[PDB]
Design a protein around this nucleic acid. Structure first.
Ligand SMILES: [Mn+2]
Lengths: 98, 342, 217, 98, 343
DNA sequence: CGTAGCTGAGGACCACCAGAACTTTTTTGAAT
DNA sequence: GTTCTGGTGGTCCTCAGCTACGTTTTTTGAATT
């Protein structure tokens, strides 16, 4: 469907293995998406990639210790997105002339 | 029902491509220029002296991503070929349909039919929409003659004749092409479709489009599990990578010439973007090439409808689909390959 | 003495009961695509598949990932779960004295379905376990995940002959490298090979009508 | 009306007045919505309140140093939000009996 | 490194290939390790986690040179080439010969001759090495019987007869292989031979070594340019590498069985790393698989001398080089493909 | 070169404490 | 009892740095809801 989704995490690093969980979660979530803010990623995925990422990521985090939220906008994401500061991000609809 | 994916263009020289998990990262003297996910990327094209890690090459090869190295003005060099993934029956059928004149002349009949139909209807549409700028009468006559050839194209059974017919189909159209231009005639020295490998201005766009189309069709053909640059249609002469051009002869007359003609007519390109070398060759400035690539991608973005069922589709999906059907014909589903007709 | 090459897979006895063209695409053309409802099944299979470890629980055994072969219907594969239960009137297993019933168990995602596309695989592995001894067992268990339910199924000759004929006819189709064309219906909106199976290529005017349309134009 | 809006900020505390900017941004964002994770807020606001909040946040933060992103999930926010972790967020449409 | 065959076999990892004038320079971490002319080369094969300078790639791609990149273990990574050369005609000859049966019979009988030669000389070396506690006149009778099958295979004409006479030597070699094991004989047994569900312990070592050798041979075929799924002896089957299995059946002697025998002997393997689950299958423990792979790599690192070429090489290059000869036979520059033969 | 495992080194982000205060006319302000 | 400004302690979070190695059989996976 090629729809834009956004993922936020919040892992407790004061536990026994918080640092390793943070590292694995960040590494796994960076593969499927592009970082826009600290602990806030956005990506363009279908239903299949979204389901695969959700299944992969629900096994790395530990319940009753972490938080993870996933939002989806839709095919019209170009309207419901606003940037005001000085942290630009690459748009995956650009011809990408590097 | 597949969806189009973006394409990554590398224009800066002395770059380096590296793999990090499922991400491609650009380096230029140990600084991170940018990283892109590889799950929404279809091909990688590099200009100048670009290097790539073998791990990235293997990753792209086994996940159907086409790497390409080019030189200055889109000169083809060192395509990254992959492996064999099985599907022995389809490959054997493709290689057995060859070296036999009957099925070869049937499929060549279909290809030439598509090409001539597309060219004739393109010229007819053009002389329809503006009559005042050009001379309609000649066009009609020309179109009429092509119609006759169409019928003769159906009534042939030997590969030797069609090539000659192709020559006629080549010489009956060039005279029209020269009077296709409407604006910037004096600035762009436009000699029709006259072509020289040394390049003589108002041909860099055509050559660049041909190279991009050849690479795209080669990648799309390798995606489905067969190879069609030297095979059951085109000449057995080595060095003529024109079957990948032949499967898109239904397209190269339309999909690239139309793009170049629209670029000329819509005032989108100025004569200052070209310059001439000391030896006489013509080269394009970097800004002109960037504008050409942006226009190419923008044209690829917008949607059309397939004549068969009416499903919405993109231009970049036109080759892949036209390859996929060629697979299903080889399995006996259809009577013969139904070409692309507008 | 290459009896292995002619052996087929158990997973080809399920796809052969739904969208008969799908089995040909999967096993003859070696093509495969994944959608939203296949990733969950793959994850469940990976979680459940725990070999190299005998999860013994009391007298009864719950053996997992059991290799399976059969000569009469000429098939091979791996059966998911086999439950061994102590019983006097059973048949002795190799290496241990006594007698144990060997009821098979297969884990599948979804709900019970009318076209018995899942019963045939269980009957096939029951056939295999019998053929390894040439005996009779009249009990099978099947499991569904989204319902979290276990259903009992008996097996009789009405399934034995059907499975035997199915294996013979599948071998006949395999030998000829033939991919058949079947009716599409509403269900092929969900078969994972829509981008490849191309359902709409059975109700078409054929290229002859396109040629005559070109003549008309 | 009454659509869900998600605001993510990212201020720089290494500058001269980073702490003051962080405090003012947090206070101005807590006045309208709840907090689900650090440096992200969600709210159920109409268009006028969204415009007022956007103007206040733009006038309060400083450019070329800070980052601010605003997304809107529309009126169908119930079927687009997914939560897996263990940081529940109070809904503002249920009977809300405390 | 540069074999008499006009190719390069750079095998040391952590190396860099660069272009200087019209020559290739091998640099080992900024120091010039070696230098070699490029005039006579036709292809370049590089093993290991390494790279190539873009100038070298651009120089090689233009003048009809393809550069293949592999892993250090032996997996196939990538192949860089412009307009492909020396591959389309090779594949055309490949399937044209495969469709016909006479040339397939010739090549298959050559393969079987190599196999029986390897088995017979292995038996002779075994009976010479330890003539202490073993059935000797049985070995001599088996050697003479394999010699008469040598002659019969050399005088074969059809696929069916070739398969029938090939199958006959297998049972004799299996009996001798069961008699073969000297050490740990009382605890390792090979009374029978199975397959898919692998009953018994030493039907697990053979299967694993066979799979590894098959993967290596498939990589060898893919890195030369020939097809790996269109075979000569084994018929076509979707998903099975027939020609890889042909070279498998040619090289399944000293390369595979000797490894298993050396693992059983010399007390380099035990039973504690091997299990038994309800049918006879041996699901190997992680430590057992680790030491198996380490021993396989160590054997691959052993140096030998090629009987035909005479150039000193390692074991890992033995398949690849052989595959190249096959290509040279399909190109018309050779008459026969002797893997291990006097001729 | 790529993938894992450990450090270490500062930026972001929020929660507490402590101290000092807490009052201002009337006017303007959209409309595809 | 609010509101505002400081000051501090403790926790998320990303990057740069340093060592230490890279192989893995074949079979099984949803669907009409
Ligand atoms: Mn299951």
């Amino acid at each position: 469907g090629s729809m834009l989704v956004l993922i936020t995490y919040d892992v407790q690093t004061s536990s026994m293995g918080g640092t390793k969980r943070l590292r694995k979660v960040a590494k796994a979530c960076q593969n499927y998406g592009q970082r826009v803010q600290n602990s806030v990623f956005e990506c363009i995925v279908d239903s299949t990639q979204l389901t695969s990422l959700k299944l992969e990521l629900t096994s790395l985090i530990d319940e009753e210790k972490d938080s993870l939220r996933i939002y989806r906008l839709g095919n019209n994401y170009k309207t419901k997105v606003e940037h005001i500061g000085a942290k630009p991000s690459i748009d995956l609809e650009d011809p990408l002339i590097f | 029902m597949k969806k189009l994916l973006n394409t990554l263009y590398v224009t800066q020289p002395d770059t380096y491509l590296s793999l990090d998990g499922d991400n491609v990262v650009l380096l230029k003297e140990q600084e991170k220029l940018g990283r892109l996910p590889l799950h929404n990327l279809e091909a990688i094209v590099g200009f100048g002296y670009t290097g790539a890690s073998p791990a990235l090459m293997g990753y792209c090869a086994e996940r159907n991503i086409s790497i390409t190295f080019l030189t200055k003005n889109g000169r083809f060099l060192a395509r990254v070929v992959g492996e064999s993934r099985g599907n022995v029956v389809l490959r054997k059928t493709q290689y057995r349909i060859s070296e036999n004149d009957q099925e070869s002349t049937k499929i060549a009949r279909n290809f030439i039919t598509g090409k001539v139909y597309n060219s004739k209807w393109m010229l007819e549409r053009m002389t329809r929409e503006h009559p005042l700028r050009v001379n309609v009468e000649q066009f009609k006559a020309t179109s009429q003659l092509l119609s006759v050839m169409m019928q003769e194209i159906r009534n042939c059974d030997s590969l030797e004749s069609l090539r000659g017919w192709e020559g006629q189909a080549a010489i009956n159209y060039n005279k029209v092409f020269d009077q296709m231009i409407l604006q910037q005639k004096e600035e762009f020295a436009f000699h029709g479709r006259s072509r020289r490998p040394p390049k003589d201005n108002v041909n860099a766009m055509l050559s660049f489009a041909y190279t991009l189309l050849a690479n795209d069709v080669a990648a799309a053909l390798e995606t489905v599990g067969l190879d069609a640059y030297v095979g059951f249609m085109h000449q057995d002469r080595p060095g003529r990578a024109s079957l990948a051009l032949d499967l898109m002869e239904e397209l190269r007359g339309l999909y690239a010439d139309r793009f170049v003609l629209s670029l000329i007519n819509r005032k989108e390109m100025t004569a200052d973007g070209f310059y001439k070398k000391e030896n006489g060759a013509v080269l394009m400035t970097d800004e002109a090439r960037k504008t050409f690539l942006k226009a190419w991608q923008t044209k690829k973005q917008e949607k059309i409808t397939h004549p068969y069922l009416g499903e919405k589709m993109s231009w970049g999906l036109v080759p892949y689909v036209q390859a996929l059907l060629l697979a299903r014909f080889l399995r006996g589903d259809l009577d013969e390959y139904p070409p692309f007709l507008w | 003495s290459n009896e292995e090459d002619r052996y087929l897979m158990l997973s080809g006895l399920q796809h052969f009961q739904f969208c008969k063209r799908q089995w040909a695409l999967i096993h003859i053309e070696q093509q495969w695509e994944e959608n939203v409802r296949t990733i969950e099944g793959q994850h469940l299979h990976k979680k459940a598949d725990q070999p190299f470890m005998k999860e013994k629980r009391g007298s009864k055994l719950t053996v997992r990932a059991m290799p399976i072969q059969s000569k009469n219907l000429q098939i091979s594969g791996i059966c998911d779960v086999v439950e061994f239960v102590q019983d006097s009137e059973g048949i002795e297993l190799s290496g241990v004295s006594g007698s144990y019933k060997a009821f098979p168990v297969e884990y599948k995602r979804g709900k019970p379905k009318k076209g018995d596309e899942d019963i045939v695989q269980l009957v096939a592995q029951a056939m295999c376990l019998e053929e390894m001894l040439v005996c009779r067992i009249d009990k099978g268990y099947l499991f569904y995940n989204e319902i979290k339910h276990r259903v009992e199924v008996p097996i009789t000759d009405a399934l034995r002959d059907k499975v035997v004929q199915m294996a013979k006819e599948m071998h006949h189709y395999y030998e000829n490298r033939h991919t058949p064309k079947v009716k599409t219906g509403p269900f092929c909106n969900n078969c994972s090979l829509q981008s490849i199976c191309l359902p709409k290529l059975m109700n078409k005017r054929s290229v002859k009508r396109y040629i005559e349309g070109r003549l008309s134009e």
